[PDB]
């Protein structure tokens with residue numbers, strides 16, 4: 001869907017920005033600093049679910065640029081595993097949110113976070 | 128969810144970027160220049176549905192900035208109508224995509240487009 005590689009860069013960075021907001025906005029809830037409303041969280045995690053599937057199609061062949069490390073493309077199987085682990089952890093978060101269980105939510109949230117960070121540590125350029 | 132107004136600006140502009148991609152990528156299909164795969168379009172419009180609901184919560188009080196015209200806030204009822212008309216047109220697009228009817232899809236797509244443009248013409252600063 002991208003006319004130039006710059007377009008794929010812009011897309012994935014915007015998807016990431018939205019992921020970051022929908023993930024990170026739950027921090028006060030999982031820490032107990034904001035109230036836990038199960039329905040609010042269930043709806044927000046549904047949004048995060050959708051967003052979570054979006055970036056990966058914008059690292060298509062030839063879309064090198066931004067803060068994407070070239071190893072995304074030369075180590076494609078390894079990058080796919082990081083992405084799939086992340087998306088699997090999103091499924092678990094969806095289950096925790098759907099169950100309405102704050103304990104489970106905080107543990108699932110921590111697993112998602114660690115998956116975001118694992119990928120960045122390997123495949124995102126230092127800033 | 129935004130620590131500073133700049134954060135809401137960044138969020139809404141990223142949501143818009145994603146909307147633009149998920150909307151605009153269907154142009155070749157509605158024009159007949161790319162093949163129409165009903166399932167592909169149904170799935171893409173589902174993504175657009177989700178995205179389409181996101182920007183409006185990031186024009187909260189005090190989030191003036193970016194290319195948002197101040198009239199968004201001083202004419203709140205009028206801006207809400209533009210947004211609701213847009214979202215209603217997204218519903219119609221969802222129905223057309225769900226029905227698998229290219230005729231209906233192209234007419235619904237044109238209505239959504241016109242709603243995007245109507246809002247921009249009133250509430251987005253010239254660039």
Ligand code: HEC
Nearest residue numbers: 013016019020023065066067068082083086116119123124
């Ligand atoms: C690899 C499988 C990743 C996972 C999982 C996550 N992110 Fe990511 N992120 C990744 C890359 C390769 C990049 C760089 C993209 C580029 O071309 O520059 C990013 C970038 C971000 C950013 C910065 C985006 C920007 O606006 O420039 C953010 C804020 C970000 N990523 C957040 C984020 C979160 C919250 C994740 C888990 C919920 C997450 N990423 C997962 C690679 C991967």
Ligand code: HEC
Nearest residue numbers: 140143146147150192193194195209210213243246250251
């Ligand atoms: C009012 C109800 C709007 C509707 C409906 C749509 N858009 Fe929008 N858009 C709106 C505003 C007020 C702004 C400016 C936001 C800011 O703070 O700068 C925008 C911006 C865009 C942009 C540019 C985003 C950027 O990256 O800077 C795009 C590409 C855009 N809008 C696209 C778009 C599309 C495709 C829409 C219909 C599917 C659409 N917008 C609707 C206000 C409104």
Ligand SMILES: O=C1O[C@H]([C@@H](O)CO)C(O)=C1O
Nearest residue numbers: 020023024113114116117120
């Ligand atoms: O909110 C975020 O969480 C991850 C990471 O910090 C979790 O450790 C990330 O990169 C964000 O923007």
Ligand SMILES: O=C1O[C@H]([C@@H](O)CO)C(O)=C1O
Nearest residue numbers: 147150151240241243244247
């Ligand atoms: O793809 C887009 O469609 C609308 C508008 O051009 C429709 O007229 C818009 O602002 C986009 O980015």
